Amino acid sequence: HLHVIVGTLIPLVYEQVEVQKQVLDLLKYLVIDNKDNENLYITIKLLDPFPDHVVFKDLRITQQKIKYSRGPFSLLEEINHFLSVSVYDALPLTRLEGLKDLRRQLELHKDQMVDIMRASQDNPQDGIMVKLVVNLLQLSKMAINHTGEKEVLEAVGSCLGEVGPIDFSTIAIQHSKDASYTKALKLFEDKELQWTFIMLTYLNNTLVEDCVKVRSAAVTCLKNILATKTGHSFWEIYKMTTDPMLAYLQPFRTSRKKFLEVPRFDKENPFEGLDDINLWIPLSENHDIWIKTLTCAFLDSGGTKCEILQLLKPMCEVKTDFCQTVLPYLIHDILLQDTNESWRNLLSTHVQGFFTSCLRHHFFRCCLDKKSQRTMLAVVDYMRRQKRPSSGTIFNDAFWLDLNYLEVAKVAQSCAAHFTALLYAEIYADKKSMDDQEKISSLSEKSKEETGISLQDLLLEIYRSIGEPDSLYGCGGGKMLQPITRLRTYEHEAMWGKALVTYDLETAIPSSTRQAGIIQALQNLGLCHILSVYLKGLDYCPELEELHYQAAWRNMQWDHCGTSYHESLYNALQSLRDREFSTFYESLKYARVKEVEEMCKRSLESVYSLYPTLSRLQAIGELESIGELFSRSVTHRQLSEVYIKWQKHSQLLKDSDFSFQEPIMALRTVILEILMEKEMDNSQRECIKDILTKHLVELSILARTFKNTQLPERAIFQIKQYNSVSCGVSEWQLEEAQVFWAKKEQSLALSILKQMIKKLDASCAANNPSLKLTYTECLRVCGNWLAETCLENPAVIMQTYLEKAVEVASDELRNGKMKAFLSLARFSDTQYQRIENYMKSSEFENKQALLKRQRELELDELALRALKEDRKRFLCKAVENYINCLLSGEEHDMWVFRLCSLWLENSGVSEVNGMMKRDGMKIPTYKFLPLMYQLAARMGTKMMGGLGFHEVLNNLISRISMDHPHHTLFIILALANANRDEFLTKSQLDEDRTEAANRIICTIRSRRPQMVRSVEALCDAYIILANLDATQWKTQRKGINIPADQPITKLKNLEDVVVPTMEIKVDHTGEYGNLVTIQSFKAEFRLAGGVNLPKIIDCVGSDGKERRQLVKGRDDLRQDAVMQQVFQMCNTLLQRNTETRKRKLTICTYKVVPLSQRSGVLEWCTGTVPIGEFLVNNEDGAHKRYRPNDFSAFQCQKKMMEVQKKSFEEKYEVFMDVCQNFQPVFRYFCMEKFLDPAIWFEKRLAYTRSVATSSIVGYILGLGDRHVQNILINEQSAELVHIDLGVAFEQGKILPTPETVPFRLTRDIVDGMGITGVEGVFRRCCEKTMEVMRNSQETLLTIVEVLLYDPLFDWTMNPLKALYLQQQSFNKVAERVLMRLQEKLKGVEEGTVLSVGGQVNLLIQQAIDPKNLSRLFPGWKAWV
């Protein structure tokens, strides 16, 4: 109670001295002299900081000393402390000092804010920043209509201005929930006991309330409840726990011989009380009396089995909130004991009547208050989560009462509960389909016919309210022709010209909306003068004045004169120009308060509703920040510091939408222009001009990154207006060239860049340190552009631009050197590839064969020698520049694949080996880790010498292993232990590889003997465990004790060995001090099923946590390892791109550690169940629990196996018949696993994105064998994990009964996506992933070329593997596969080049085609 007392006493200090002395000495006794007490030390530490005043100086000093013990606080620790204090809040006004301190901490450190955002990337839902934002919003909500409303609102707006519109990667707002409450609820296993606990907790909380009338009712109810047998059982269960409610309720609990018994009274007709229509449907007002009367009627008349409910009448009579809380429990209790469904029918009829009355529009009964609607929605939501007496399924449990869920969904949408509205719409659609089967556009028109509500329109409205961008595409197609929908689509896609044309053309649209859209489109197109003249013409609604003020402050007119937002901003800027600082600060404070109040008045359902308010608050905060700079004398250091702060906080907004970043940049530009105008000092004016030029260049770059062209041109024009140029060399001219190039005006950009190059060459010989970077960048960009447009021959481009750029060229200089080296290497590689393609082409061989049938031969020999010399020169240049590029940076690290491919192919070339030995060894070792498998498989002992390939490769492998033993030791040892399986139980290339691996192992052991010995022992134990026969316990499923003779049990405390199946973060330094190490193995091991019966074991590490590992014998895991490497590279590519990073598109991966030719170990995914196990299980499959009257999976499999020998027509007919009697059921996974609508929506969206990404990535890699048992779904995250990666690169199409689908997109997979199916989120995510794949075709091609040519990678289909799957020619096969992959990446399908959307449309229609699905193998289970 200390915090409550302190918060109450703090305001009383200012009242008067007479009470000030008493309050001060009481507080001093509370905190000052009590610091010795250990019990209250934590309570004092977790307390609100005292207000900063002279009176509180000693208290503040003591509080700071106590809190900041054991070290200082970081930003994350400060926010955690703020939230922990916020756990208990008596009043919002007591949090003002904490809010100010939090704002100061946030504004002081933003690099720590970047670190926090990076750390929270893995689990965005548990992000600290979004939690802080929602906590602040809730605090501001609680401050409405109180004494300190404006003070709290201003502080909340001040702190929210610091964070700004950061992309939180969340869509659903998760309100804070008590952890102890959930655990206490979990403790009780009986329904009646939980009601008792909840009611007693509510009464205990009510006891503290001020009203004396409610206290008597609360104590009476407590005494009545605790006397009964249910109360005694509750106390017996709950006395073991630790909670102050136990101590508070001790006096009321009494011991009596007989438990208090409630006299059960039964009327002649219990249904007469609740049969009144007026009772259920209230008026517009009088909600409290309505809910009280309904609760009394339920309690007095309806017979309730539970004794606790009957004792709640005195508490229900006084408090309305108690009635609202208890009504669902009363309804559930009455429905539990219902017989003959009389109560069910009556309640269903009355509730449906209430919901229909809510949907009118006055009428006789309509326009009900939102409180009653929310109460009924809470009743429905509570009933949805309760298991029905007849058991059944969650879908069955939804219909406790016969309800038309479309009306309920519409009411929920009207109440701003969008996620539950979508869930109820889905439930209604499913119920309508189920009912129709007994006897969207069709469903929409039917629902409009009977219920008067269109399903498609409701779904569109709900998805618009949610704010998810991708979902809006798949809503429907009924109203696409309407101008309003087209205009909304144009605005969403930033097609401002189309939106402007449509707004001008359509006149049926209301004038206000039409003019607002016209003004917004004109502003977004950069037509500022046209917009101003148009507004002047309109002079012949508040929104019009709002747009007037926005245009006025954006155009700096300064003449166009409840206050709104842009009006406040314009007034603040005008007063800032007029040096009226008081009005400036007052207007900014008023704008803060108004924006925060408007934000907190909303229901706060989705995160996307917070971004505009955050952007506006950030703009206001920046204006207030520059206010003090304008107030005092302007210095260069202050301007540099404020620009650095702006750049950091813009870096915080990297992934934010352009619609939120743009107003901030516009305000910054106006700010800088005003500051330059009001300078009157040449020395500072130059610095202000430089700052404005840098800001405008950054704005141009930002607008170009979002495919915007008018804004960069306007920014360049402003730069020209201010930064008048006569020297003719500057970075903004390079930015102008880039802008012109972005507009597809290549001639102008090339002319500008060549003029800049000639001016730079004439001015100096690249001797100015400031202009060196600009010269190098101009040369490199011009060379790349000329190469792209083919306007110059390769010789001129190489000699004039790229080689010169390298020769011209301190972090910026290092980055420029890296970029120039990469460009030169890429051009040289292009020339080398062109010359090699010509040498390997059929035209060259035909020309050679023509002369095969005398000076012609001499000329041919001379030409061949010249071609070979040119090829070698290009190769050497490319390799050298790649090596130099890898040295000077880390951004282009994935080019190590191309470098290693070039080195490996030309092994015999001494120059390449020489430059790899001299400068290649200086490359950091961690950059070779992704290619460790190939580099280790390529090593041998044949070419031994000073510049021999094998010697250099062995040295590189040894250095990599020395620097990163944890990442490479297992691979090398597995190379050495290829044939140790037979030795443990009882070709020249292979033996050379074994010898090289043994040599590297000997070197590492000479460096680290103990680690090598322990790793060898662990590998031997794993191999011995794998070879153990497990057919004895094949039927066993409860776990089997490992035999004592197994060496694995003996191993203990291996502190030099890290858990092999645990992913390890790459460390540039070679310390690796703090890593989890293997401690012991649990005695029991389980079986996962399958032909070979793999064993699952548990490995407890240094900490208490343990990891499950899958030990596989008689199986090859190297293919899985390399496929996981490909998946990691694709994940890096996806995370690098902004569009795929925003959607969190990733490929789930699991670490695989091969041990021998046929032995290995891999990480076992926890919480993942196979989709086939969930769907078509014989015992408790989803197809059996739901739709039990349909065909069983056994019948479908039998029919499809029987129709195997018949023709294609018979197969198609049988497949259609099976699909008719086998409906999808997979949509219930998220419905039954996640009961909260927001969590359900998030998990379903994650599932859809995972399906899209996995499908696209698998198609790019030609992934096959994607049956039900090879796909797992995580129960916690609802994401799919693809396993058994043996078949890839379209080798499944060579099988008998070839696979004719790019990926698995069967009816269950699409059904899991929701009512929209493949439309909406899935299609757009597939398009984004395919676009990312297209943009990185060269990197993927290099990676796959390195992988395929790996000697140890067995990826070609063979007759033995073909027979097992369904119960040199290698060079040309690999070339054909690479060409097919290149065609896929470029988009060439069957000789026709397609766009990303067209290719995605083709893939989807090929995957979902029943014609292709019918011809597939019956084991693939296409019907599932």
Ligand X SMILES: Nc1ncnc2c1ncn2[C@@H]1O[C@H](COP(=O)(O)OP(=O)(O)OP(O)(O)=S)[C@@H](O)[C@H]1O
Which span sits near ligand X by CB under 6 A: 115-123, 809-817, 1090-1098, 1221-1229?
1090-1098
Which span sits near Mg ion by CB under 5 A: 327-335, 1230-1238, 1277-1285, 1372-1380?
1277-1285
Q: Is 1145 left (phi over 0), alpha (psi -120 to 50) or beta?
A: beta
Which span sits near Mg ion by CB under 5 A: 248-256, 847-855, 1245-1253, 1268-1276?
1268-1276
Token duo for residue 965: 């033993």
CB of 1152 to ligand X, least distance (A): 8
1284 makes contact with Mg ion (CB under 5 A): yes
Q: Which is nearer to ligand X, 572 or 1365 (CB)?
A: 1365
CB of 361 to Zn ion, least distance (A): 5
CB of 1284 to Mg ion, least distance (A): 4
Residue 1277 to residues 181, 1159, 1168, 1249, Cα–Cα distance (Å): 24, 31, 9, 12
Which span sits near Zn ion by CB under 5 A: 51-59, 355-363, 1125-1133, 1134-1142?
355-363
1269 makes contact with ligand X (CB under 6 A): yes
Q: Which is nearer to ligand X, 221 or 1147 (CB)?
A: 1147
Which span sits near ligand X by CB under 6 A: 101-109, 291-299, 808-816, 1086-1094?
1086-1094
With CA atoms as reference, report the closest residue to 398 among 435, 424, 429, 372: 424
1090 makes contact with ligand X (CB under 6 A): yes
Number of helical H runs and strand E runs in the chain: 70, 13
Residues 6+ apart with CB under 8 A from 18: none
The full 3-state SS of 1257-1296, as one line of letters, equals HHHHCCCCCCCHHHEEEECCCCCEEECCCCCCCCHHHCCC
Place of tokens 């798949």: 474
Applying CB under 6 A, among 367, 1088, 1379, 1393 the residue interacting with ligand X is 1088
CB of 360 to Zn ion, least distance (A): 6
CA distance 275 to 353: 12
Residue 1084 has phi, psi (to 5 degrees) of -80, 145
Applying CB under 5 A, among 367, 501, 839, 851 the residue interacting with Zn ion is 367
State the Cα angle at 125 between 119 and 129, rounded to 5°. 60
1150 makes contact with ligand X (CB under 6 A): yes
Applying CB under 5 A, among 70, 186, 362, 1205 the residue interacting with Zn ion is 362
1173 makes contact with Mg ion (CB under 5 A): no
Q: Which amino acid is at 1195?
A: Q
Q: Which is nearer to Zn ion, 110 or 287 (CB)?
A: 287
Beta bridge partners of 1288: none
The DSSP annotation for 523-589 comes to HHTT-HHHHHHHHHHHT--HHHHHHHHHHHHHHT--------HHHHHHHHHHHHHTT-HHHHHHHHH
364 makes contact with Zn ion (CB under 5 A): no
Which span sits near ligand X by CB under 6 A: 472-480, 639-647, 839-847, 1157-1165?
1157-1165
Which span sits near Mg ion by CB under 5 A: 476-484, 583-591, 668-676, 1267-1275?
1267-1275
367 binds, among Zn ion, Mg ion, ligand X, none (CB under 5 to 8 A by kind): Zn ion
CB of 943 to ligand X, least distance (A): 38
Which span sits near ligand X by CB under 6 A: 476-484, 991-999, 1087-1095, 1336-1344?
1087-1095
CA distance 1211 to 1192: 19
1277 makes contact with ligand X (CB under 6 A): no
Element containing residue 343 per DSSP (H, E): helix 342-358
Residue with smallest beta-carbon separation from Zn ion? 362
1190 makes contact with Mg ion (CB under 5 A): no
1288 contacts 1262 by C-beta, under 8 angstroms: yes
1284 makes contact with ligand X (CB under 6 A): yes
Applying CB under 5 A, among 318, 366, 516, 528 the residue interacting with Zn ion is 366
With CA atoms as reference, report the closest residue to 588 among 613, 551, 623: 623
933 contacts 960 by C-beta, under 8 angstroms: no
CA distance 361 to 227: 50
Which span sits near ligand X by CB under 6 A: 677-685, 1084-1092, 1349-1357, 1378-1386?
1084-1092
Q: Could you tell me how far CA 1321 lies from the centroid of its own chain?
A: 14
512 contacts 520 by C-beta, under 8 angstroms: no
CB of 1270 to Mg ion, least distance (A): 5
How many residues line the site for Zn ion (CB under 5 A)? 3
Q: Which amino acid is at 213?
A: K
Q: Which is nearer to Mg ion, 655 or 1284 (CB)?
A: 1284
Cβ atoms within 10 Å, residue 160: 29
1110 binds, among ligand X, Mg ion, Zn ion, none (CB under 5 to 8 A by kind): ligand X
Token duo for residue 756: 């800049």
Binding pattern to Zn ion, positions 786-805, x when CB under 5 A? Answer: --------------------
Cβ atoms within 10 Å, residue 105: 20
795 binds, among Zn ion, ligand X, Mg ion, none (CB under 5 to 8 A by kind): none
CB of 1093 to ligand X, least distance (A): 9
Q: Which is nearer to ligand X, 194 or 1092 (CB)?
A: 1092
Token duo for residue 798: 């190489």
404 contacts 358 by C-beta, under 8 angstroms: no
H-state helical runs in 385-438:
394-398, 405-414, 418-438
Which span sits near Zn ion by CB under 5 A: 48-56, 366-374, 424-432, 782-790?
366-374
Q: Which is nearer to Zn ion, 287 or 418 (CB)?
A: 287
1283 makes contact with ligand X (CB under 6 A): yes
855 binds, among Zn ion, ligand X, Mg ion, none (CB under 5 to 8 A by kind): none
Subset of 1163-1222 contacting ligand X (CB under 6 A): 1164-1165, 1168, 1170
1394 binds, among Zn ion, Mg ion, ligand X, none (CB under 5 to 8 A by kind): none
1327 contacts 1396 by C-beta, under 8 angstroms: yes
40 binds, among ligand X, Zn ion, Mg ion, none (CB under 5 to 8 A by kind): none
With CA atoms as reference, report the closest residue to 1339 among 939, 936, 930, 1064: 930
Place of tokens 């107030």: 631
Which span sits near ligand X by CB under 6 A: 218-226, 652-660, 1020-1028, 1091-1099?
1091-1099
Applying CB under 6 A, among 958, 998, 1092, 1356 the residue interacting with ligand X is 1092
928 contacts 956 by C-beta, under 8 angstroms: yes
Q: Which is nearer to ligand X, 307 or 1163 (CB)?
A: 1163
Q: Which is nearer to ligand X, 971 or 1110 (CB)?
A: 1110
Q: Which is nearer to Mg ion, 1280 or 1340 (CB)?
A: 1280
CA distance 671 to 533: 24
- The pairing of beta strand 1095-1101 with beta strand 1084-1087: antiparallel
Cβ atoms within 10 Å, residue 211: 12
Beta bridge partners of 455: none
764 binds, among ligand X, Mg ion, Zn ion, none (CB under 5 to 8 A by kind): none
Which span sits near Zn ion by CB under 5 A: 25-33, 365-373, 946-954, 1234-1242?
365-373
Binding positions for Zn ion, rule: CB under 5 A: 362, 366-367
Binding positions for Mg ion, rule: CB under 5 A: 1269-1270, 1284
Binding positions for ligand X, rule: CB under 6 A: 1088-1092, 1094, 1110, 1115, 1150, 1162, 1164-1165, 1168, 1170, 1269, 1272, 1283-1284
